[PDB]
Each structure stands twice: as structure tokens, then as C-alpha cells.
Amino acid sequence: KIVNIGAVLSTRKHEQMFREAVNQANKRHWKIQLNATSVTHKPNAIQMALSVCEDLISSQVYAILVSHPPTPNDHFTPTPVSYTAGFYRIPVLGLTTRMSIYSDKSIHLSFLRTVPPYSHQSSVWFEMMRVYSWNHIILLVSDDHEGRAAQKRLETLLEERESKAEKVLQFDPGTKNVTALLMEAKELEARVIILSASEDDAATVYRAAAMLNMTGSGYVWLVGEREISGNALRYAPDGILGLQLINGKNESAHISDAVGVVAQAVHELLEKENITDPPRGCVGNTNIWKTGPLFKRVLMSSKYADGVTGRVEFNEDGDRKFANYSIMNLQNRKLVQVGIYNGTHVIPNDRKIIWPGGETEKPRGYQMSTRLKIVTIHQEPFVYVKPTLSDGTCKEEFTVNGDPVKKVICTGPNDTSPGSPRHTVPQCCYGFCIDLLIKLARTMNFTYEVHLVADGKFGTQERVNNSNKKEWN
Amino acid sequence: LNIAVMLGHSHDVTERELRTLWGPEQAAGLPLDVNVVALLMNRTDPKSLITHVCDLMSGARIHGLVFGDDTDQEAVAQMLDFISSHTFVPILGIHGGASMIMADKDPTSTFFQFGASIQQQATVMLKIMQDYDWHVFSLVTTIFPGYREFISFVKTTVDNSFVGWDMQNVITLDTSFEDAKTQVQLKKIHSSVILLYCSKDEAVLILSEARSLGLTGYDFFWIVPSLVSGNTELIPKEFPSGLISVSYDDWDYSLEARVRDGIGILTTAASSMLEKFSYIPEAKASCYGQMERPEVPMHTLHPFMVNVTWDGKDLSFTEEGYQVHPRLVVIVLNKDREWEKVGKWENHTLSLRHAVWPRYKSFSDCEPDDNHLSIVTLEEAPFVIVEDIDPLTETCVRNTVPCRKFVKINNSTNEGMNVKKCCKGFCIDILKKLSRTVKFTYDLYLVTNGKHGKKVNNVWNGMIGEVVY
Amino acid sequence: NVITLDTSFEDAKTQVQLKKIHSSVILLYCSKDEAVLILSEARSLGLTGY
Amino acid sequence: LSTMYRHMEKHNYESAAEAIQAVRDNKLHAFIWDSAVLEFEASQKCDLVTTGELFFRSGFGIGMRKDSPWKQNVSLSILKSHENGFMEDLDKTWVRYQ
Amino acid sequence: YIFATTGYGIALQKGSPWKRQIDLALLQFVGDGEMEELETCWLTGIC
Ligand SMILES: *[C@@H]1O[C@H](CO)[C@@H](O)[C@H](O)[C@H]1NC(C)=O
Ligand SMILES: *[C@@H]1O[C@H](CO)[C@@H](O)[C@H](O)[C@H]1NC(C)=O
Ligand SMILES: *[C@@H]1O[C@H](CO)[C@@H](O)[C@H](O)[C@H]1NC(C)=O
Ligand SMILES: *[C@@H]1O[C@H](CO)[C@@H](O)[C@H](O)[C@H]1NC(C)=O
Ligand SMILES: *[C@@H]1O[C@H](CO)[C@@H](O)[C@H](O)[C@H]1NC(C)=O
Ligand SMILES: *[C@@H]1O[C@H](CO)[C@@H](O)[C@H](O)[C@H]1NC(C)=O
């Protein structure tokens, strides 16, 4: 009859409020069936895991509620407690876990969360774009499991809107001089910047962007939660549109919501038959719960309409569904609430949006540099290619009608032979396509960089250097 | 230095210790002292495992642990993440958690399993299709995790492929226990090969449903990965015969041989470490004290797993610990409900098969299909000329039917080697045109006994002689 | 090629018989209740397309 | 036409400029390329004659990219050049030299 | 003599996603010889 619920918490106030919450859940539903047992966090790594596993397995605990950080900021993720509880496939609900390590269901079997992960930041970009009416996205994401998951989710949700990402750049952790990626981003016509990395990576990017012309005007900086805290606030230029989650910080509220969720599950556990007694002795039992997947099915099929946050729904990942989003604009290094999203509805605040640029109008992510580089194959009847004069220009000839023969400066290799140094020397090329290019320039503003073919062939499918590859030549 | 080996309940510990010691005795003489501490225990509890590994690292300073356990629990591999990320000790395994590897995390861990890589299995799954000459596919997946990566990988490898695979539109099943939308999703099948990415129970349920839905015919093909198969001793009655599966089985390679290979790999890694340095780093002295930040300044063997070779076999590990040259034993479910080895994928990442096509018999005791009409051809260069195949990782160039010709080894032995050869002819075009009208398949069967046929004492030879009997 | 259904209340052989349809026009010769039942089954079987 | 590759894969060249020289010094007995190029070469140099009939008649084009927004602005320019006599003037200034 | 060629083809309404499906098929038909064999069916003349 007695069911034990465990938690790894530091402060005694959290234990007291958990006891009050479970007592209220028993009052709100007959007989007493819930017992409270909590343990304290330790600075160790393996010793604390052994202690909590010994105190937990020998106590017949069904539900686990552990906050992700034991301190305001540390790397002590609650991986060991979940892994110890996974021996018998014990359902675990995360209080403030947000790293994507727990997101995948392949490794984690019965370890869910009570708060949405960072993956929802990828989905909210679509909500931002459908309001700002943009079509170009440039991604600045570090190399980690969270980054890979965000990239995969964004690609899956973007491939259905007939839009494709222009360029994807990778941030190697620990790097300091990454100005090459910023230069590549500058050399792109689109000026929409999306960043999702750690605090150190964000600071490193901002240090370069301070000197570089990446925040002057015509740029938008949409970043995640991790860049609205720490040194990011004091080293972030104004106009950055941040993201935050409402009611996602109160540990007491999270514990109350978790207790409310588990209250229905405790009562629904006895509804189904074929229930087995919880294991008491840690040593001497290596069995598997028959109702393991049944608990997950019941939790997924359950619906909740009460709580501090509000309606709670579980998706296939096991986290909250249709979470509330808030836009935290950065104006004079001060957080300003602008946009509120419930998943489908848009509720913008009456305060005007202050862009990082001087103008308050919405920037356009379409900056055509008009530097259309054109490469023309060396064809005798179509383009006359001759060496240029040593004075610096090319001689001008005339046709039978006496009209001048217009020509453009062309740059290409001279030797054009394998195993030879193909020095880039400008040449004098003209022909049928030169007149068409001149007409195009007259009709619309065009600038031409007349390149030449690298090898000398149009190029077809190439299958070399491995078992299977296809690269155009 | 000292490497401890932990195994489940097995033969007496003395024999296992002798087998482990026989490693350095045979070859690879090294001045480093190799000491092995073998332990046997039924229990596999997490706290017990932590205490045992702490005792092993405290006593004699064990620098390597390999856990070959017969337990079917999938969390055995995950239980050692703390040990790998804190004690900086290489981690190996044979069975149990190491049998199937799917955990990807930070590179601070020292996990290096001998199991088949989850992404690498698709390469063999497509190469067997290429060898069997079926370019049409039906990619059927589920909401189970670890399959979106499969979809991305197969899309990437068919977009970059120059063979010309007829990638039919995929059907992504949502969940089981529907009975109303599954038929709607599966009614669009029109190919002959269907994949399945689910669990064991889900696969059994979907095959049972397809039995009533008529999708278990003698013409369809089913490819199943190693996840559903798993152990090769339980054969549910819902699995039709002729199923094609690929896994990492130990039919030929023994646990002792795998332990010897792992010990050799570890010794080679230690020898390579001793080249650029001069001392072997040691882990923490005590399991209960934390007097320093657990950093990694000793330059551990994490990047040194690439240039490790043992017994003349290239046994390397990628950045994720995946084996570069796994085994990938192919198992086919026979009509007697057993798994038989067909293909091996050990030599130069190349696989060969015994070429046993007919495996469809006695499924529902009905529809005795006989559409596999054998076609006999005669070598007639003006009309039907055959030749070799240029090496381009392909079998058919554009539309040629695969010609399987029996080739004799020499003038003494008598074995018909099954070698595919490219063949073009007017009769081939006639057969191709007739196929679109008769709507049936025709597998060519070239012959070499005789040319036309005579009457030598009322005996028929040649193509006529072969077709008479 | 014609498909001759034997009887209703099968739920095991009706799908096998009806899986061979590849045309756009399908006839039906049954009673009122049998026609209602077969159309209800085809609703789940996806044979009631536009 | 698979028999063509029995000789194409061992006698093909890399440049039309050197191919013209090879076919002029009796190295090549035949050459396959665009009709316009061969007609221009025959008009300019007086040691080659075309023969046969046009096969695989396909026109030229302007290569672009799927995300390039310069589709209509180029198509309209091409139509203007075609229907305003610009193409005719270019042909008259680049065809029928003799 | 031909002036202002501007050869015609199959039209399609604005915003129709079938253009990418029909242009490839038409190009394949033109390049594979369907036009050449069907030319004698209708384009008959005395020269
Ligand atoms: C709850 O469990 C703990 C540990 O088993 C036990 O000490 C305590 O007495 C239990 N609570 C009650 C009210 O019995
Ligand atoms: C970064 O590297 C580039 C060239 O690789 C160099 O020009 C630049 O000065 C470097 N910046 C710093 C801060 O090292
Ligand atoms: C880039 O910023 C520097 C100041 O950091 C400025 O001097 C320079 O003119 C800017 N370049 C452009 C192209 O605006
Ligand atoms: C406590 O949680 C509630 C959500 O129910 C939230 O509105 C409130 O701001 C939180 N209080 C503090 C001090 O964080
Ligand atoms: C080309 O540039 C000039 C000056 O920069 C401008 O006046 C003109 O409008 C431009 N052409 C077009 C088509 O916008
Ligand atoms: C040409 O200019 C831009 C660039 O393509 C394009 O948006 C515009 O619509 C074009 N002009 C007209 C008149 O269509």
C-alpha cells in the first residue's frame, strides 16, 4: 500500500515543500499510500551516485524528481541517478533538465522531463519567421549532441516549407580565432544570423563581432536562452532579441506540478492488473518490470488541465507540449518583453521593437551585391580568347561595318595543362556572349567577373577515389 | 600494465587465466608486466559493479577492463560511462552491453566495442541488395528512436549513388495498435522488397497483421536489422521463412579468441603510447576522495586508437569507437526455423554470398507460386554475346539481365563457380519486351554442357537435353 | 480478372481477395446489410477513395 | 550504341582546339560536336566540310541556380533580344562570313 | 527562313508545382527520340 517517492535535493525547504505537496495530493486523491524520502547532493561524482543508488533501490521508489543543477551553475548533470534507476527501468521525471543528452529515447528508456528542452527554440524560429516574413537563415551552432539534434529538427521542420538553409557553420569548442566563419557569413547576400552555442562560444563570437561590421545595421541576432545570462549580457550588443520561458525557474512550482502529475499516476497504477511488488533488496534481483512500458503508455495517454503553469501535455519525447514562449528584447542592456507565443497565437506587446541598427524599421535579408561571377568555357566560335597587350589593356578592332568590337577583361589560366602551374593571369576574351552580357548590364545593373574553366571540360559525374561518390566537374 | 578481464559464469577460472596468459606467450613480447585477475559472479548490480571496479583499480592498478557478460540487459554498456569519464581507463567488451552499441556521448569516454556500428549496417544492407540485383526499395520506418538517422543516411547514399536505384516513396508508420490507419499507410506498396525498423514485439505484431492482410506472399522480400533478431534461439511463429537479416554472431569466433584480440589491441596501444612518451599514467589512488580537478593532462589513448593493428588484421576504431572492419555475419531464416550463415563481410569490407535464392515454401499452405520460370540460353555471339564486367561497383550497366554462368576451376576438380557476367543480345531484348506483356519475372540460367544436342544412345544433351528432363 | 467474394464476417480472407484491385470502377452484388458492412470495412481498408 | 565506347574511351581528346588540329592532320577520320560550331569552323577555315543530318537537336541555355531570383528578369531580356531583332543582328554579324 | 523563333510549348498556370515534373519528362522525351519517331506520324511533306 505504501508507495515511496524519492528526490535528490539540497535545501531542506525543498524537502519540506515536497512533503507538503505529497500530503496535499493524498488529501486531494482514501488510505495513506505515499511516503516521502529525500537525499542530499554531494560534491563527489561516483561516491554520490553509489550512495543515492544504495539509498534508493533499497527503498522501493517508483518516481524520481531531481533538479538538473545542484548549484546555481555547475556541470553536475543528473546522469548518474537516472542511470542507476535504469537498472530496473524506473520512470524518472526531470525537474529542470534541459540538455539534449536526455532528449533521445534510444539511450534513455524511462527518463522524462517536466520542462521543455532547447529543441523548442528551433521550432520557435518558424513562429518568428512567419511573423517577420523572412526566407533566409544562417546557422551558427557549435558541435555537440544538442547542436546535432537542433540541426536535425530544424532541417526536418524546414524541408516541408520549400525553403533550404543557405550555409551551415560549425563552432569547435575551445577555438578563439574563428574570424574565417564570420568573413564567410559577411560574404553572403543574406544577413539573418541564428546562433546557438555555449557561453564561452557566444563571448568569443561577440568579441570578434564587436570589431567586425556584424552588428552595425541590416542584421538580426536571434539567440537562445544560454546567451541571455552570464558574460553574454555584459558583452552583448543592444537590439538582440532573446528568448525566455515563463514560470520555468520556480523550483517550488516545478515540484508542485510534478507532484500533481504523479498524483493521478499513483491512483491509475492500481487500476491495471498484473502488478508486481517493488524490489526491496538491491542484491538478489535482476528482473525487469512487466509494467515498465505500461507506465510510459499511461503517462502519455494521460491529460492534465491543472497546475501552476497550466495545461500539461506529453509528446512522443516525453516533455511538455505547446509551451509558452517570451521574447526578451535587449534595449540599452535591459530586458524588454515584446512577444508572447502560446504555440499558435501571436501576442506582441505595444512597445516598439528596437533593432540593433539605427533605423527602427524591420531589416531586409536581401542584399544583392550584384557581383555575379560568370565562367565561360573556351569555345573558338563563341568566345575569341587572345592574350592581352603588355601595356595594361586590350587592343580594339573593328568589323566589316566599322563598328567597334566591345570586349571585357577576362581572368583565367594560361598553360591550361596538367602538372603545370596555372597562374591566374588576366586575358582578353570576347565573342557572342559578351554582347549578351553587355545587353544584360544595360537592362539591369550587373557587374561581371569573367572567369575561365579550371580544367577545360564542361564537367560530368565523377566516380573516383572511393567506392561511390558523385561530384560535378 | 596489469589488465583485468571480467566474464560471466563459464568454465573454471584457471583455464581462462591460462588462456589470457597465453597471449603474450605466443608473440608480442613486451617488457611491461601483464597481470590478469579474472572474476566470476552471477550478480550484475550497479553498486556491486562500482565496488568491484574500485577494488580492481585500487589493487595492482589495473589499466584496462573488459566486461564480457552474458546478461541481456542493455544498460550494461551505459553503466561504465562514469568509470570511463572519471578513471580514464580503456573500456572493452564482448557480449551483453557491448554486443550492441548505440550510445553516443562526449569523447571523454573510453568506450570501444566490437559490435556492429548502427550506421555501418545500412552499407551491408544495401550492398547485399546490389549483389542480389534488386535496385527497387521500400523504406518503412517507425517512430522508434534511432531511425531518422537511418532515413537520412539512406537518402544521402542514394542521392550520391550513380547506380540508379529506383527509390520508391517511403512509408513512415506512426505507431502500432491502430488497426485502421496501418492498412491505409501500407496499401501503397508496389515493390518486392520491404524494410522493417521496429522492435521485436512490434515486428511480430506487424507480421501477424500482414499475415491476414496478405503481405506475406512468396514474392515479397523482407530485410530485418540486428535489433529485432538479437539472440538466435527464440523464433516466433510469426516470422516467415526466407527472411534476410544481418547481425554480429559468434558462430566461428569464440569468446576466448575475442579476449585475446582485445588483449593484443591493448598491448599494441600501450606500445604506441610508449613511443611518444616514457611513462604509463595512473588513475586516482582512492575511490572516495576528490582532492583535485579530474582533468586529462596525460594525453590518454583516445586519439591513438586509429594506428593499432594486431595479428596482421586492421582492427581500428573511429572517433565514435565504431569498428572499422566488423564481421557482419548474414543469417537467413530457413524453413526449419533456424539461422544459417550466408555472407561474410570481413575481407576488405567486401561481402560474398552462397547464392541461394529459393527460400519461399510453406508459408500459408496456399498459393503455390511458380512464376520463377528458368530461362536457358546458348552462347551465340552473333545473337547472344556475353562478356566480363568492368569494375565500377555495378552489375548491370543499363538494362541487361544478370547472366549467371557456371565456371569450372581447372581440368581436375568439378565445381560450378557462380560468377555474374554482363550479357547483351537480341533474345535478351525479346525477353524484356515479352516480360512487360506477360507480367512475370524470368531469371536467366546459362548452361555449358553441350552446344545444341544429339542422340548418343538415346541420351539428350545441350539445351534441349537440359529442358527435356 | 473478376474477384468472387465467398461470404462476409471473415475479416481474414476478404482483404486477401480484395488486395488485387487495380482499376477505378468496382461493382457490388450483395444485400443492403452486406453492402453496408463491406463499405464500412473498406472505409478502414482505404478502398473508399475519391 | 555501346560499340562506340569501345573506341571513344581510348581516342577522345580534351579540347576542341586540339581536336580540330588532330582532324586536320588526318589523325581523326570523324568528329561529333554541335552543328553551329562545325558550320562556323567550315565557314572560317576552308579545309573541312560538314555532312549528314542533325541528330539530338537540343538548344543552348543559361545556367542558373534554384534559389537565384534572376529568372524572370533574364527570361524577359532573352525574349526582348529574340523579338526585337537583336538575335538577328548578332547572327548577321557572326554568321555567313563568306 | 525563320525570324523571331520563340518556339512555343506546353503552358502552365502561375504557382503550379507541376512544372518541375513536366519539364523533365518533356526533355527526356525529346532527348530519347520520341519526337523523332513521332515526327513521321504527322510532319509529312514533299521535298
Ligand atoms: C518512508 O520510508 C523511509 C525509508 O524506508 C522510512 O524510514 C520512513 O519511516 C517511511 N515513512 C513512514 C511514514 O513510514
Ligand atoms: C586569425 O587568423 C587570421 C588568418 O588565419 C589572421 O589574419 C588574424 O589576424 C587572426 N586573428 C587573431 C586574433 O589571431
Ligand atoms: C568595419 O568596421 C570598422 C571599425 O571597426 C570600420 O573602420 C570599417 O569602415 C568597417 N567596414 C565597412 C565595410 O563598413
Ligand atoms: C513561482 O512559480 C510561479 C509559477 O506557478 C511563478 O509565477 C512565480 O514567479 C515563481 N516565483 C518566483 C519567486 O520565482
Ligand atoms: C542602377 O544604379 C543606379 C545608381 O546606383 C540607380 O540609379 C539605378 O536605379 C540602378 N538600376 C536599377 C534597375 O535599379
Ligand atoms: C528585376 O529586378 C528584381 C531582381 O530580379 C526583381 O525582383 C524585379 O521584379 C524585376 N523587375 C521586374 C519589372 O520584374
UniProtKB/Swiss-Prot annotation, chain B:
Effect of C198Y: In FESD; uncertain significance; severely decreased function in ion transmembrane transport when expressed in Xenopus oocytes; decreased localization to cell membrane; changed glutamate-gated calcium ion channel activity characterized by decreased glutamate and glycine potency
Impact reported for G465S: In FESD; uncertain significance
Result after altering G416E: Found in a cutaneous malignant melanoma sample; somatic mutation
Annotated effect of mutating V419M: No effect on localization to the cell membrane; changed glutamate-gated calcium ion channel activity characterized by increased glutamate potency
Documented effect of changing T156N: Found in a patient with schizophrenia; uncertain significance
Covalent S-S links between cysteines: C54-C287, C396-C422, C403-C423
Binding site for Zn(2+): H11, H95, E233, D249
Stated role: Component of N-methyl-D-aspartate (NMDA) receptors (NMDARs) that function as heterotetrameric, ligand-gated cation channels with high calcium permeability and voltage-dependent block by Mg(2+). NMDARs participate in synaptic plasticity for learning and memory formation by contributing to the slow phase of excitatory postsynaptic current, long-term synaptic potentiation, and learning.
Domain notes: Contains an N-terminal domain, a ligand-binding domain and a transmembrane domain. Agonist binding to the extracellular ligand-binding domains triggers channel gating. A hydrophobic region that gives rise to the prediction of a transmembrane span does not cross the membrane, but is part of a discontinuously helical region that dips into the membrane and is probably part of the pore and of the selectivity filter.
Protein name from the UniProt record: Glutamate receptor ionotropic, NMDA 2A
Source organism of this protein record: Homo sapiens (Human)
Gene: GRIN2A
Residues shown, of full length: 34 to 502 of 1464
Curated annotation (Swiss-Prot), chain C:
Subcellular location: Cell projection, Dendritic spine; Cell membrane; Synapse; Postsynaptic cell membrane
Domain-related comment: Contains an N-terminal domain, a ligand-binding domain and a transmembrane domain. Agonist binding to the extracellular ligand-binding domains triggers channel gating. A hydrophobic region that gives rise to the prediction of a transmembrane span does not cross the membrane, but is part of a discontinuously helical region that dips into the membrane and is probably part of the pore and of the selectivity filter.
Family of this protein: Belongs to the glutamate-gated ion channel (TC 1.A.10.1) family. NR2A/GRIN2A subfamily.
Protein name per its UniProtKB record: Glutamate receptor ionotropic, NMDA 2A
Biological function: Component of N-methyl-D-aspartate (NMDA) receptors (NMDARs) that function as heterotetrameric, ligand-gated cation channels with high calcium permeability and voltage-dependent block by Mg(2+). NMDARs participate in synaptic plasticity for learning and memory formation by contributing to the slow phase of excitatory postsynaptic current, long-term synaptic potentiation, and learning.
Residues of the full protein shown: 202 to 251 of 1464
Subunit (UniProt): Heterotetramer. Forms heterotetrameric channels composed of two GluN1/zeta subunits (GRIN1), and two identical GluN2/epsilon subunits (GRIN2A, GRIN2B, GRIN2C or GRIN2D) or GluN3 subunits (GRIN3A or GRIN3B) (in vitro). Can also form heterotetrameric channels that contain at least two GluN1 subunits and at least two different GluN2 subunits (or a combination of one GluN2 and one GluN3 subunits) (in vitro). In vivo, the subunit composition may depend on the expression levels of the different subunits. Found in a complex with GRIN1, GRIN3A and PPP2CB. Found in a complex with GRIN1 and GRIN3B.
Organism this protein belongs to: Homo sapiens (Human)
Superkingdom of origin: Eukaryota
UniProtKB/Swiss-Prot annotation, chain D:
Localization of this protein: Cell membrane; Postsynaptic cell membrane; Postsynaptic density membrane; Synaptic cell membrane
Glycosylated position list: N73
Binding site for glycine: D34
Positions in the Extracellular compartment: 1-98
Processing after translation: NMDA is probably regulated by C-terminal phosphorylation of an isoform of GRIN1 by PKC. Its phosphorylated state is influenced by the formation of the NMDAR-PPP2CB complex and the NMDAR channel activity.
Disease: Neurodevelopmental disorder with or without hyperkinetic movements and seizures, autosomal dominant: An autosomal dominant neurodevelopmental disorder characterized by severe intellectual disability and developmental delay, absent speech, muscular hypotonia, dyskinesia, and hyperkinetic movements. Cortical blindness, cerebral atrophy, and seizures are present in some patients. Neurodevelopmental disorder with or without hyperkinetic movements and seizures, autosomal recessive: An autosomal recessive neurodevelopmental disorder characterized by severe intellectual disability and psychomotor developmental delay, involuntary and stereotypic movements, spasticity, and inability to walk without support. Intractable seizures manifest in some patients.
Protein family (similarity comment): Belongs to the glutamate-gated ion channel (TC 1.A.10.1) family. NR1/GRIN1 subfamily.
Comment field on protein domains: A hydrophobic region that gives rise to the prediction of a transmembrane span does not cross the membrane, but is part of a discontinuously helical region that dips into the membrane and is probably part of the pore and of the selectivity filter.
Protein name stated in the entry: Glutamate receptor ionotropic, NMDA 1
Lineage: Eukaryota, Metazoa, Chordata, Craniata, Vertebrata
Residues of the full protein shown: 699 to 796 of 938
